[PDB]
Design a protein around this ligand. Structure first.
Ligand code: IEM
Length: 347
């Protein structure tokens, strides 16, 4: 694999098993919040202080987000987000005991230390369609906050829809313009799209929300939005971003300040038929589908779900990246930290 600043497991199978990582960077505190599902199923958390001089992040003790759950329900798919205009930390998740899935959220005003009680967002965020679905989910992974005047909150999601045939999945985004006070359900993207993530890319003059989703084909599906996620113009398959047919695998995408507005970074297993070899792909001409690069190798061996966070400027001057990913046959969640220079010397 390529050179990295740090490589350590932060969650490890033992008394419990850990899966479905989500990473969040709190810019002003130079630190990260690493969430995971603890499988009696809850969401756990780990806070890490990043120290540049020593090129390392120090992880504190694992904690349970006691408030992120409903009585008699298991919690899944932790989707974190930090509101830069309020200083409020959001943690969206799914609670499960014919649709019976619930959308929830818990907030923290002290950087994750404590959390408000949950808020069941289901009925108002979904409406009548709720009955037309089999189930649904958000993320997993970090969410997105836009540049629009209202600094809208965009939460990536997908739903299993029912038209004889099994429910077909379609990605979409939950949108809030009042800082998570109310929520609207965005429009689906091409059918058969699942777990996805969204990144904002300011190109030309207008904002462009790019969406990268898991599919049932040998390739990834990517869609674009010019209306903050309400509608996703069109979606194209991206041959350069493989999906092992077994059923595919969740992937992560983020935007970051270009070295010369922003570029995209994407992580996902690179093996054609197996969930192995975590690779990093770079898109310097976002969101062009054909601009995606060959993958650079980050981790060898079995790798599954992952989540990326832009961490500012790295020790070498280039963009810094933190990555949380499932590994060794789901025996742990590994935290990886590296720079644009370490991953793409040529760019
Ligand atoms: C909410 C939930 O059950 N998520 C599952 C996810 O469902 C994929 C379906 C929708 C095709 O599958 C996997 C997986 O290892 O591929 C682990 C997640 O925990």
């Amino acid at each position: 694999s390529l050179p990295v600043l740090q490589k350590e497991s932060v969650f490890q199978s033992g008394a419990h098993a850990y899966r479905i990582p989500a990473l969040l960077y709190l810019p002003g505190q130079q630190s990260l919040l690493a969430f995971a599902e603890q499988r009696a199923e809850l969401i756990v958390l780990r806070r890490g202080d990043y120290d540049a001089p020593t090129h390392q992040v120090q992880w504190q003790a694992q904690e349970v987000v006691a408030q992120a759950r409903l009585d008699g329900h298991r919690s899944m798919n932790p989707c974190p987000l930090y509101d830069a205009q309020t200083g409020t930390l959001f943690l969206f998740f799914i609670a499960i005991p014919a649709n019976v899935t619930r959308l929830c959220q818990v907030t923290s005003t002290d950087h994750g230390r404590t959390w408000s009680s949950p808020r069941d967002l289901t009925d108002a965020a979904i409406g009548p369609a709720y009955r037309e679905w089999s189930t649904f989910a958000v993320g997993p992974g970090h969410c997105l906050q836009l540049n629009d005047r209202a600094r809208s909150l965009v939460v990536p999601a997908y739903a299993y829809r029912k038209l004889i045939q099994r429910p077909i999945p379609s990605a979409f985004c939950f949108l809030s313009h009042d800082h998570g006070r109310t929520w609207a359900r965005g429009h689906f993207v091409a059918q058969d799209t699942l777990e996805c993530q969204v990144a904002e890319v300011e190109t030309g003059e207008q904002r462009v929300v790019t969406l990268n989703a898991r599919s049932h084909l040998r390739a990834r599906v990517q869609a674009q939005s010019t209306n903050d996620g309400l509608d996703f113009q069109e979606s194209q398959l991206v041959k350069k971003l493989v999906e092992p047919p077994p059923q595919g695998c969740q992937g992560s995408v983020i935007s970051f300040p270009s070295p010369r507005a922003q570029w995209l970074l994407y992580t996902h297993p690179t093996h054609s038929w197996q969930r192995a070899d975590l690779g990093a792909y770079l898109n310097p001409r976002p969101p062009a589908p054909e601009a995606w690069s060959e993958p650079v190798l980050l981790a060898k061996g079995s790798c599954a779900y992952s989540d990326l966070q832009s961490m500012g400027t790295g020790p070498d001057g280039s963009p810094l990246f933190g990555c949380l990913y499932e590994a060794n046959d789901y025996e742990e969640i590994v935290f990886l930290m590296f720079t644009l220079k370490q991953a793409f010397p040529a760019e």
